[PDB]
């Protein structure tokens, strides 16, 4: 009754791998290299796995034994595709030929003689004008038993391969709207097994800029700056978000009929106030609408709008045309901790007290993917530079990299002594940094999934990280009210004032209380935020 | 007699009607409800070494947890209100603190 | 000082260590349950007994008193009606008697409280001492007039979002944690609304139907 | 004697609760606290809530000593608050002495 | 004059399982829906083991 | 921005095209996935026969015949029969399970998505067979749901790959740690990390959103037919739904239709009527005005002139026309009480004079001057006579008699 | 010294979790919390014992009362196992097909906070 | 490898149970003590979680009540004053209690105490080179 040893773990892992037949019938010390790949070979892998099975069999096929239907379904489809006078009815026309051939061929393998002849008679006279297809249409005429299909040469390639068709997204949705309108199960089976539709989209040292908030009084929680460096947003314990204009311009809203931070009685009139030019702008705005302490505010890639999360387990999108909440995403039953947006504003994810993170799109108000597997609160989340992988920190001292599209854990690092609080990817997509209460800064090597570097020196909780646009330097902020920049690149030094010697470049602990944020910009710029008192 | 969700809905409001997903969800919730209630009643029966799951077990559980009182099963089990009296030592310390406060 | 910093942290007790152990019985045809998810109906008195006995067995009992079956059936119906009431309250007006008893769930009477006429009608038509047809017709007309809804509108059938909001708000209709926690997550994963493309196809189909009608 | 409409009456009801408190509470839920009508109504609801508890507490205090006069100082003890609060599902259990 | 202390983290006398049940080795469920299928499969494997002898 | 997205989409399209056409080429035992990749590589080289068709479309179903592989079979019997599982033995033997109904569709959901259920593995490991192939388990789906040929095969053998999922990995972690040793949380996490590292898909670590565009396109095309409305439509006609519908035929009708009940119960009582004068069942037609074209046969002999008569007229000279009333026509009526009472018996006199077809009247009181009035015609004269008689009787309030006279 | 033993216990707990500083009355709050929890558990045990028709209470009654209390009040999110099942059932659905955008696309209006109350009248 | 966890004494649990009016045995007291300690530690962890996401070190009573509310537990009322509540020992020297002074209501009822509002937030920019 004793704690297992380090080697015993490898022993059990090898036993598992052998039992499930993953490695050869010997010590696969040769094996264990395929831990990365390039774009083209990833595409090849995914294409091989895409055709290595059928997405839907059991439910996609009809169960009632009523051969009369095969006529009715095809007849209704033909009638609908005929009277239509749309440009889609064009693009969704070519499908009829593979549909007929495959429906007839499947009738043959199970259908009493009465049905097939009526079928051939009822529709055959529309696949003649073209020459390339008259051949097989006529060939089918003399075919009753299965030996017909196996014997013949042209029927075979049809039977053992799929027919290709090309559609736009709009056209495919045109077919789906009809398919769902009523029982069309037989056609769904044919499309599932035999036809292969293909849908594609239609056509010289650094300089620090610092910011300080004076009158906060234990209420400021977080702050951020937009990419184009024109706005400054902050959240507060008392539910509210305040916005400032960095430039010399003022902020003025435009006409809008509806506002949720307002209450009207039954005896009111919706009127657009005209006594408005009197204002003609201001330097600050208060955004209202959350009913709990706010914990994160993020900008879009193009500074168009703002997104935020709050203790009230809601996520709100703010329109900077009018500085008003206009969308509301509800996908949680517990307070939401963190938030994050993808590089080109395609997705955004959120960690929550419910032990899970969730994927969202800016055009649907309900989650799309769920990443379960952590043992406790998911406190941190960050997208990959390519926007295809997802890292998340948790209070269980673990970090997991996820596959965005598919949604399963691909890596699991361990080694932290306490909960984790931040994450950061280098823009070359090679490393991943993480920091927590342990006061150690670890960079991981994604490809190998092993510790790459460890930095020490901070004496209190580290709560932010960021890389330079050339993976040159990594900046960190701690609860000791300090900002330290680091360099990992080969350039070595001899300055061992503490544990880490050659990486610690600069330290900045001026007159400043708790820090808030750290960023980088185009040219050696490092924006900071926090509160002070003096 | 056969029973459907719409039959219950009519009792509450005749003119309303649900979607299909809501109908599935409500039945799932009912399954969970039964699975919890029966287990709790069985444990309450197990407490007193009894051999049979009597109704009074269900009555006690429903009253205490779900605040539900089903009316047509008699009043054989209603606890008679007590005095809820205190002990010597307690009153002793209370008197001591009263004294220490007086002067 | 740092090394002994995370040795006294909190260690939550895993909820599965106290999980119930499952024992396999004889697979018979007669030993079946009919969980309501399978049969889309409320379980009858007889069907409930089969599963009640089966559950009782794993706890070392003999049988059920047969008054318990009635109580459980009544309670299940009561609980479902409670949830339905919670969901209904969020999208229709209603009245109150004795301060909590809600009966008339239409959207009719609801006198607008900011009209001098409404103030007067409230004092009389509400406090009635505890009805010829002409008088009743007159007073019904008056109540509809005071309501203020000149052009009333209606809602689509009840969908997932209504259930989610109702459950989040009230939350006293499911006091037990186990039932609420497991089902709320399920409800979340069934939220849905048509996206842009589907609405475009609805547009097209409406054009088509209008044309074929002319 | 008069029966003016509700909004005319509301302008005369002065609430004990200050307006700034109601504004504080409205700002938590994310509302702009500038409409006087909403402030008045919320304050009045809170006042009613407190008044009912006060009335019940005073009645319970009156009934306490009956068996075994008017001129006496009425003071409020936890034994008067507990039953009054319990009407609203508030279970008050407070220690007396520690160690 | 020392606060009494123990050598192990405390544990709750009774806690809240979520109505879960453990099917076999290393698998837990919450709804009783796999009961029928598990009985069937167990018998199948029993017999398939009997015949190899 | 839009420009960067267009660049990334072009890159993704190019990569997809090239990977489809020009695959790159990447042991004692060669993995099942290795064999799949190789059979894919081969199929690219070939050319198809038909235009608008492809070859590399079923890498599994083709790689089945190319050798023996141990699979798990599923039997989907028709009607309300159910489904069952088979497990081929080492000895040309077999085993099969009870037939489970089509309502308990818990397993079919797993099959519908190609996901390995976790209940299956715990037993399949106990059954000492090597049916696993790199985690995944190949399965064969036979269904007699639709067939009326009464043949030997009578099923369509489909093959699918049940990939393992995160549920299976957590179950495995639970299973390995249940050994006699102790395990601390850190150690469990280490084990899980090693397992994930070993069996995870390779990572395409590269900073460019072309990667995500390619991945989105491929995955979307993989699963573009699992929209919520699709699944609702499938579920709406599945077998369990039909079984539920049949039960509904016996529920009673709502209110406002009780009239059907009244009519049904009434009809049974009886039917009868004496002196039934109807002779038509189709007497309840609408266009009763229609008349068939009827051809009558010529009568043998028509005898109209026996009854026709001409009226006398004053024949015409060459200056004046005929004038038919041949003589003055006079009619008189008298009325009297006949009692001793004084009643002043009165007289009425209709007249039609010579050569004048108009009628006239006069009501002077009979003895014991020229007040004529125009009366229209013979029918009018009869009307006037009747009305006068009625008036005289109603005014007399006693017996009164009518004495008619001519010319 | 000034404090009783319980205050020291609570301060030690706060230290254990890693709390450096805090408002003073927090400790009084924690003391009241513990007192209320204990008293309510005992009161429930009384009822559960009197249900079993027996003399003064014992271990089993208390454990049953604690189980009933924990089934209601002291809660926390479901475990990893259940979440994995729901996640599997969720991820099968397809994601939107990317395309060039002049900025991120918002969802349709019928599902956005941009609808005025229909009762209200509008003015020009 | 050796570690400690302060726990309340059996005597405190028996003293609490006394107010109820029940004489408790030996095993039951330790059972209750361990259960109460576990609940206290759970609640404290939950409270600390909310403070973690605000960048402030002091823990308020609002945080504790918030954590209690999310865990579906009634809240504790009467300790939100931001001012110390000194304890008092009795004569013997083993029992303690909190000071609870009687207060004359009418004085507070009839009194004007204007409060000072708060000041608006503002941000100054502060550049530097290094």
Numbering used by the authors:
A (entry chain B): 1 to 203, 255 to 585
B (entry chain G): 59 to 161
C (entry chain J): 104 to 233, 248 to 331
D (entry chain H): 114 to 181, 188 to 218
E (entry chain N): 507 to 559
F (entry chain C): 1 to 26, 31 to 372, 390 to 428
G (entry chain E): 10 to 133
H (entry chain F): 5 to 134
Please give sentences taken from the publication describing this entry.
The SAGA complex is a regulatory hub involved in gene regulation, chromatin modification, DNA damage repair and signaling. Human SAGA is a 20-subunit, 1.4-MDa complex with five functional modules: a scaffolding core that includes TBP-associated factors (TAFs); a TRRAP (Transformation/Transcription domain Associated Protein) containing a phosphoinositide-3-kinase (PI3K)-related pseudoprotein kinase (ΨPIKK); a histone acetyltransferase (HAT); a deubiquitinase (DUB) and a metazoan-specific splicing (SPL) module. SAGA regulates gene expression by interacting with enhancer-bound activators, recruiting the transcriptional machinery and modifying promoter-proximal chromatin and is known to be involved also in DNA damage repair and signaling. Here we present the cryogenic-electron microscopy (cryo-EM) structure of human SAGA (hSAGA) and show how the arrangement of distinct structural elements results in a globally divergent organization from that of yeast, with a different interface tethering the core module to the TRRAP subunit, resulting in a dramatically altered geometry of functional elements and with the integration of a metazoan-specific splicing module.
